[PDB]
Design an enzyme around this catalytic site. Sequence first.
Site, short mmCIF file in Angstrom:
data_model
loop_
_atom_site.label_atom_id
_atom_site.label_comp_id
_atom_site.label_asym_id
_atom_site.label_seq_id
_atom_site.Cartn_x
_atom_site.Cartn_y
_atom_site.Cartn_z
N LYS A 88 -7.14 0.98 13.37
CA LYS A 88 -7.43 2.39 12.63
C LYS A 88 -7.16 3.52 13.27
O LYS A 88 -6.62 4.67 13.19
CB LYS A 88 -8.64 2.43 11.79
CG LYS A 88 -8.96 1.73 10.79
CD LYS A 88 -10.09 2.00 9.77
CE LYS A 88 -10.31 1.50 8.43
NZ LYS A 88 -9.45 2.15 7.43
N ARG A 105 -3.61 8.99 5.08
CA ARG A 105 -4.09 8.56 4.04
C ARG A 105 -3.05 8.66 2.88
O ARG A 105 -2.43 10.00 2.83
CB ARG A 105 -5.49 9.06 3.50
CG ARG A 105 -6.67 8.31 4.26
CD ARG A 105 -7.03 6.94 3.85
NE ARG A 105 -8.15 6.28 4.52
CZ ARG A 105 -9.01 5.52 4.20
NH1 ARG A 105 -8.69 5.01 2.87
NH2 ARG A 105 -9.96 5.07 5.11
N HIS A 142 -11.74 8.30 7.53
CA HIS A 142 -11.18 7.50 8.81
C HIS A 142 -9.75 6.85 8.29
O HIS A 142 -9.57 7.12 7.06
CB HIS A 142 -12.11 6.10 9.27
CG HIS A 142 -12.44 5.42 7.84
ND1 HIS A 142 -11.64 4.25 7.37
CD2 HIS A 142 -13.88 5.18 7.36
CE1 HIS A 142 -12.32 3.57 6.54
NE2 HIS A 142 -13.56 4.42 6.05
N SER A 176 -7.01 -1.48 5.90
CA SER A 176 -8.07 -1.24 4.90
C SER A 176 -9.33 -2.02 5.71
O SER A 176 -9.11 -3.34 5.72
CB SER A 176 -7.79 -1.53 3.61
OG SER A 176 -8.99 -1.76 2.82
N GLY A 177 -10.41 -1.49 5.61
CA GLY A 177 -11.54 -2.22 6.15
C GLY A 177 -12.07 -3.12 5.05
O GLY A 177 -12.60 -4.31 5.30
N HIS A 178 -11.87 -2.79 3.83
CA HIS A 178 -12.17 -3.44 2.70
C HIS A 178 -11.43 -4.91 2.75
O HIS A 178 -11.65 -6.15 2.54
CB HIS A 178 -11.91 -2.90 1.26
CG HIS A 178 -13.12 -2.05 0.86
ND1 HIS A 178 -13.66 -0.95 1.50
CD2 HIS A 178 -14.07 -2.44 -0.23
CE1 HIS A 178 -15.06 -0.56 0.89
NE2 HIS A 178 -15.07 -1.22 -0.20
N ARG A 180 -8.99 -0.75 -3.58
CA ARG A 180 -9.02 0.50 -3.16
C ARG A 180 -7.73 1.40 -3.25
O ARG A 180 -7.87 2.57 -3.02
CB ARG A 180 -9.27 0.22 -1.59
CG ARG A 180 -10.66 -0.81 -1.30
CD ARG A 180 -11.96 0.45 -1.51
NE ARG A 180 -12.21 1.07 -0.52
CZ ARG A 180 -13.02 1.88 -0.25
NH1 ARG A 180 -13.76 2.42 -1.36
NH2 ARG A 180 -13.04 2.72 0.67
N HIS A 239 -5.76 3.97 -0.32
CA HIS A 239 -4.96 2.85 0.43
C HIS A 239 -3.46 2.73 0.00
O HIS A 239 -3.35 2.73 -1.39
CB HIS A 239 -5.59 1.82 0.80
CG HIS A 239 -6.72 1.71 1.87
ND1 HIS A 239 -6.63 2.17 3.09
CD2 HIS A 239 -8.05 1.46 1.77
CE1 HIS A 239 -7.84 2.07 3.73
NE2 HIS A 239 -8.72 1.69 3.09
N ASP A 269 -1.90 -1.38 3.95
CA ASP A 269 -3.36 -1.42 4.51
C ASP A 269 -4.03 -2.77 3.86
O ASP A 269 -4.70 -3.11 4.53
CB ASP A 269 -4.06 -0.16 3.88
CG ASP A 269 -3.56 1.19 4.28
OD1 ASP A 269 -2.94 1.22 5.31
OD2 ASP A 269 -3.81 2.26 3.59
O1 VO4 Z 1 -10.60 1.30 4.85
V1 VO4 Z 1 -10.82 1.49 3.25
O2 VO4 Z 1 -12.52 1.20 3.38
O3 VO4 Z 1 -10.83 2.99 2.83
O4 VO4 Z 1 -10.73 0.52 2.48
#
Ligand code: VO4
Lengths: 555, 556
Positions: free
Chosen positions: A340, A348, A410, A415-417, A479, A485, A489
């Site tokens: 990221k 975004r 961020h 994507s962190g999810h 998300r 996202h 992502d």
């Molecule tokens: O990185 V994302 O947590 O916004 O899915």
Amino acid sequence: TCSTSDDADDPTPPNERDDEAFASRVAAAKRELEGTGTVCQINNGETDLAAKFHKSLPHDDLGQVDADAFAALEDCILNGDLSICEDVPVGNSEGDPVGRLVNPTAAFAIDISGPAFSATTIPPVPTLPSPELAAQLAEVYWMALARDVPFMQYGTDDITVTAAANLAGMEGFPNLDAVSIGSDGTVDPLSQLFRATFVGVETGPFISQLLVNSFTIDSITVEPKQETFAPDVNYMVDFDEWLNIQNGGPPAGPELLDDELRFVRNARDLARVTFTDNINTEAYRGALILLGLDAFNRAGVNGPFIDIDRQAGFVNFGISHYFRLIGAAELAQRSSWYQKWQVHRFARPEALGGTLHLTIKGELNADFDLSLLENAELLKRVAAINAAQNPNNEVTYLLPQAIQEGSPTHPSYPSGHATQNGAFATVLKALIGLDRGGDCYPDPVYPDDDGLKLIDFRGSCLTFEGEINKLAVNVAFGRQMLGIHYRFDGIQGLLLGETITVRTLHQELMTFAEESTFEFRLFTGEVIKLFQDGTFTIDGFKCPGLVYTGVENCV
Amino acid sequence: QTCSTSDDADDPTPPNERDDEAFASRVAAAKRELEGTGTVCQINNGETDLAAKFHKSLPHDDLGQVDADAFAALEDCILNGDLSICEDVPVGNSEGDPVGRLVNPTAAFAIDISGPAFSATTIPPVPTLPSPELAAQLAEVYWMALARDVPFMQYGTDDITVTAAANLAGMEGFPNLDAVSIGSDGTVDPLSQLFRATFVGVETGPFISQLLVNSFTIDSITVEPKQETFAPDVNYMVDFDEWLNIQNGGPPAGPELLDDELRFVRNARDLARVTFTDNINTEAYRGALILLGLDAFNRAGVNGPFIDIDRQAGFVNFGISHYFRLIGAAELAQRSSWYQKWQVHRFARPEALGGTLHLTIKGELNADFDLSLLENAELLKRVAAINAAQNPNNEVTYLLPQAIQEGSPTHPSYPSGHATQNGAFATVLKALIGLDRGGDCYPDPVYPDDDGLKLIDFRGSCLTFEGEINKLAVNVAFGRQMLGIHYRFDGIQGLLLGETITVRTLHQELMTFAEESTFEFRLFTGEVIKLFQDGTFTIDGFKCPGLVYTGVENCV
Ligand code: VO4
Ligand code: VO4
């Protein structure tokens, strides 16, 4: 005080237990050293600041970042120093927590376990002018327009029947990550729109069985009707509200909620899940349901214990092992953070939505591909839904957000999810194993269009492994469905998560006393098998590297 | 692309040195563990009597005494970390029921790359079978069985719990039990001390943690914790043949009878039921979500080093990813618990000492139990009567009534794996929440009414978050004891093992973080630990001499 003997039933003497633990750990680390070598992080090379992440910094009134501030952000990203990161200018001085940079220095920590943060890579993002970026951005816009269409009405509702024809006509569309698509290039709304080709995602109902069936936790049986968003209202479509959010200011207010509790039955609902989840909550629920259905055996007859009679697993190959990794596999988020911030730093979808809207108004001249810039069918619908919402019916082409705050502070990619859900799906499949992974989900259902009742699904076998993969892609794409996202992502974060998790899984497997392996199906369909001597196969083919680095390298 | 000294990462280390730097950091971390560990001596109580050792599922004679050769086969299985050798351990019953399988005896022999290795920590020797401490440990388990159906708020009036408290306080070894809650006057107050511990906050307020009785929200789904619970009065394994069948690894006699009404946890039987149907960390996960919703931990990331600054929030470090990651990862302490159970102490479960007690009272065996237990008239008359009412032909037995038909899991008693993991999770929640917020009072505390159908507002004490977190861990440890399957030393020693181990892992991770930061929170016994990135650490402000943490007693 002992030295060569004690009361333990342990072959190693007390005064050698310390040396043997050190030796084992040095060897493990040496294996990561040698298996890693030189890893090259590569981004798409575009220099335009419009395509970069800078939410919460000071922007001009066209949403264009302040130069000095962006250079202070690059300073902060590079140096892993709290104090330098506190020097990055903020574009709104109200001190709201949504304005804070979300832990930009996180990546710079060498965890002792698993693959180091810079040992894995994800592909460059499509540049801003590309046909691919256009179709990826249009897909986020169409998800927003389709938020209140019930999944079972995808084949007949005007919005999704149109979305499928319009997206399939975009030049870049067949190049979207794992895009669900006919061989003739068409998109079937009911079974393909907003779907992916990972195993089991295109089969049956859109939402995973693990998100709509009941779960029991500590003798408390829970039916998953949630408190969801109200239909038809979106946020950040008034220009000043949008700009205020890019500058780091507080949300305009709370989101409107529905008075009736409902099962997840449309994209707004799925997006709601992902706005109110906490790291592994969806996967934890899935873990409990799978345990209850005996896909994973609570008494411990899993792994090497399935073939023997006297022993049951627990710490290894039992619920201790399973629930431990369901949390511990979240360590892939550190690599997600490096990607990221230190590497890609991509804008975004709401920020590109601002650039697009201004370009359409003639106040900016961004080089978007004409397949988006001239996409009348999509832009007229956006203009109309925004004008209906806005004061004085003012037309904007901003990307409608399902949440007032827009994205987290961020960068978009990955994507962190998606990274953590790819890791959790991999942990579940590996512990359940290939055989049980292929069994069919018993009594599959899908919520009715109001999300008030469950309807019995009568169709193809929904495999356990496919429903686990579906769960992960649901969270990732939820998300995207909030507006924050893009498909790249989600797909690339899922693969990042699987790769890192295979590395940790294999590292741990090599330490266990009992003879055992892991075997399960990856998202793209190949069967991986991990062995205690450090070797591994992809569909029976012994791979050449010392450690797993992705299916593409196993040739 | 290839590359050497430069790539598109904004990283000061060249690509071709990033592999080197990760190996260097990992070797230095492993070396700190090597030098801080040294020689660690595992000491058990030294008793040789087989009646005091675990051997559930092996063949036994008709007095429940273990076949000698089977036991030596089990010792060989424990020693060698070999699946095949463990498949040769004899089984006392051939039906093939999964309750008869040995529970992962080779688990301990795995060197995890992170945290303290499996043999780097110790727990004290167990009280021997003839000791007064053991006698009072086991009597407490029996009184917990007799008090199972008494609502916690009726402890002060119910004759069962009023007598339990006095009976236990008069037992010679009772005052020496692990963190035993007792007055300075030597009496046990039923409402606030019976079946409690002196860990911070446990004795304040209602018996059950607020984290187990208040609603939690998961993915926008709000859940009221009314559970499907056991029916009252029925106990199992009190008929001798059924008990013996269970010790030889045979199948349970039946399912447990359940109550038709869903209820909040309001008695020892209900708390036991939680622990029979939980899954590793479900109770702390529920508490973690409750705490997050109350802002004891901040969901937006304003935690740890971010509390004092304005531009950044935590996430991977000092935010929800850190928090949920460790709530699962800290289960790694279970490898050490497994080593202590099988390889070190191998102690007999309460149901097994109960069969020895029963047979000794009947004159069929002659075990040297201390007279505080063997001649405890109050306990013996009540056990005989409750078991005669349960048994089909009213036959009297002195077996310890179990709340579940299968009795204990098939693995040694000490320590409790439930206690070790809940000590670790409690430790994670306190460290991330931090000392200051740990001292805030629970906002809307309650206690379930006696029927477990309504929540009654509580008042008169500040229930600190750290105290309610500690209480939940002790409730989970003691709920296993209320099932009939663990002793208080299993629970308290397990909780402390899980804490020490977790401190070791927390510190190791802390030392890697780029951002300047520390951990500071209160341990179970009350001291404030503070962890620093240079490897030093303090106990109530005193700099400890060891390299790495090895418990409060070594920081002097
Ligand atoms: O990185 V994302 O947590 O916004 O899915
Ligand atoms: O799981 V116990 O170790 O608490 O039986």
